[PDB]
Chains A and B, each alone.
Chain A
């Protein structure tokens, strides 16, 4: 014989269609919804996505990659011309060592 409440039946469902069939995602203000569609496709795709594609498609030599390609080509031709085998092992100088004796 008591209620513990005073409020409306929750919720009050409002369909976002059926007042604007020409509406996009949010509220029935017909101008700013078109403004949102325009800004999300122009300032979100048309100036961001394809420009980012052209930006990341080519840029300087990332991790000095093709620099290392041409450097390795010149170094292999250099070491083939000077008779020594390519990739001299023991990259640090074996004369430049001070071993702990035993």
Chain B
């Protein structure tokens, strides 16, 4: 799929992304990002031969903070992209009622489907 206001430059998050509700505090995906940041700091302490789970705690705090920050911005972009996809889809449904008719919902009292048993 393509822009949809590429005219209107790249715009990392548009101003209409403030109309949707933001990702809340302690949402589980950013919590997973924070856990991955802690594991990244732990494996950074594991590359060089320093003792793991110690003597790197400022690096732990910096890595977890930076990854949670970047993941927050990426979640905001993700939410905007799915919302604008839904708005474009429903506006295209509203713009052309002729092309997509609804099925005449015949009930199961008058749907004929053959049987083909198993033995």
Direct contact of A and B (CB under 8 A): yes
Name which residue of chain A comes closest to B107, CB basis: A98
Interface of B is mostly: loop
Cβ-defined contact, B109 with A100, below 8 A: no
Check: A96 CB closer than 8 A to any chain B CB: yes
Check: B112 CB closer than 8 A to any chain A CB: yes
Which residues on B sit within 8 Å (CB–CB) of A98?
109-110
Cβ-defined contact, B112 with A97, below 8 A: no
| Number of B residues, CB within 8 Å of A | 3
Which residues on B sit within 8 Å (CB–CB) of A96?
109
Which residues on B sit within 8 Å (CB–CB) of A97?
109
Which chain A residues numbered 75 to 102 have a C-beta less than 8 Å away from chain B?
Answer: 96-98, 100
Which residues on A sit within 8 Å (CB–CB) of B110?
98
Docked Cα-Cα span, A100 to B110, in Å, equals: 8
Q: Mark B31-52, 1 if CB is under 8 A from A, else 0.
A: 0000000000000000000000
Docked Cα-Cα span, A88 to B110, in Å, equals: 23
Give residues in B with beta carbon < 8 Å to A: 109-110, 112
5 example contacts (A-B, Cβ-Cβ < 8 A) are as follows A96-B109, A97-B109, A98-B109, A98-B110, A100-B112
